[PDB]
Amino acid sequence: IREDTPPGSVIQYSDYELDHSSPFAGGVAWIEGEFLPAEDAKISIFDTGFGHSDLTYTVAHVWHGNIFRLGDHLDRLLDGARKLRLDAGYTKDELADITKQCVSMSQLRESFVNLTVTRGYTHQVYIYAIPYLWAFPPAEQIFGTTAIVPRHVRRAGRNTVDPTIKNYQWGDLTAASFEAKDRGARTAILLDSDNCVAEGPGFNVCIVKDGKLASPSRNALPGITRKTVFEIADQMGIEATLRDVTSHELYDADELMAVTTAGGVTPINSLDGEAIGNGAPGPMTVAIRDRFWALMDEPGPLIEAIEY
């Protein structure tokens, strides 16, 4: 339900206890129209979401009992489903109610919330709310992580397995993560076929150079964390641009950061074993990350309180 986070840092879990009398406590899944405890959640092996990975999905997070940008996530999920000729069979409002009920039943104040739409065996909608998941550990959110550029892997292009529609087809992402681990790095930043920056295994990459922020426009998910970071940057008076970022620019960056729903804004201290800047989290990354976590507690349109 919780994990250690750096003391006095912007990231702190809620202080509360689960009611274990409820079978729903700690995880809830909605499958084939029925809410279920997460542990028993199961899907037909014959769903083409398995055999063909014929699906799209989104993930939203809950922090301090508030779900973040659920409407944007549902818009993205439904837009991608339409591009894949998938019919969820539920309206955006209906999905929102079900999702929020999954969180409420789990009792989780911090949660990783998944909505998946699959072609099915009749299209299927699967939803779950489970304890908070970290793409990078809390310590790395605060003190930074390490990356490599794969020698042997590139990101799949938009004309193959399209990264702009969120998907479970991680063959290149998994291969890149193994290469990073083999090389002693925490993660990988993948290039596309033209040696432009694409994205990482589970995150977008933002590049800071000369006081400006850039992020890839082509072979990358249009991330909601990235959208949030760009809004924060705009409010700070920083110019933030979605554009092609060349491999030259990646290696020459003043700061690098990974951004994703599961854990937020992660500084990247080094690339290919070479320090980025001073080898510690950059000033713009720190400013944006701290503002991002403040949004989770501030009343506004980006967050909605779950009713437990």
> What residues make contact with ligand PLP under the rule CB under 6 A?
59, 199, 202-204, 221, 223-226, 259-261
Distance between CA 154 and CA 152 in Å, rounded? 7
For the CB of residue 163, give the shortest distance to ligand PLP in the complex, in Å: 6
* Beta bridge mates, 260: 264
AA identity, residue 106: S
The Cα–Cα gap between 207 and 191 comes to 14
Query: Which residue number, 164 or 247, has a Cβ lying nearer to ligand PLP?
Result: 164
Q: Are 18 and 91 in contact (CB under 8 A)?
A: no
Closer residue to ligand PLP in complex, CB, 26/201: 201
Residue 301 Cβ, how far from ligand PLP at the closest point, in Å? Answer: 17
* C-alpha closest to that of 99 among 2, 19, 18, 29: 29
Nearer to ligand PLP, 25 or 155 (CB): 155
Q: How far apart, in whole angstroms, are the C-alpha atoms of residue 142 and residue 147? A: 16
> In the complex with ligand PLP, which residue's Cβ is closer, 263 or 281?
263
Instruction: Round to the nearest angstrom and report the end-to-end CA distance of the chain.
Output: 16
* Shortest distance in whole angstroms from residue 19 CB to ligand PLP: 30
Instruction: Using the minimum distance from each CB to ligand PLP, give the nearer residue, 59 or 115.
Output: 59
Residue 34 in contact with residue 105, Cβ under 8 Å?
no
- 224 versus 233: smaller Cβ distance to ligand PLP: 224
Instruction: Please count the other Cβ atoms lying within 10 Å of the Cβ belonging to residue 108.
Output: 30
CB 8 to ligand PLP: min, Å? 26
Question: Cβ 122 to ligand PLP, closest distance in Å?
Answer: 27
Q: What is the dihedral of CA 156, 161, 162, 163, to 10 degrees?
A: -50
Query: Closest distance between ligand PLP and the C-beta of residue 268, in Å?
Result: 14
Q: What is the closest distance, in whole angstroms, from the C-beta atom of residue 81 to ligand PLP in the complex?
A: 15
Q: Please say which residue, 18 or 161, places its beta carbon nearer to ligand PLP.
A: 161
- Beta strand 145-148 with 187-188 is parallel
Separation of alpha carbons 198 and 196, rounded Å: 6
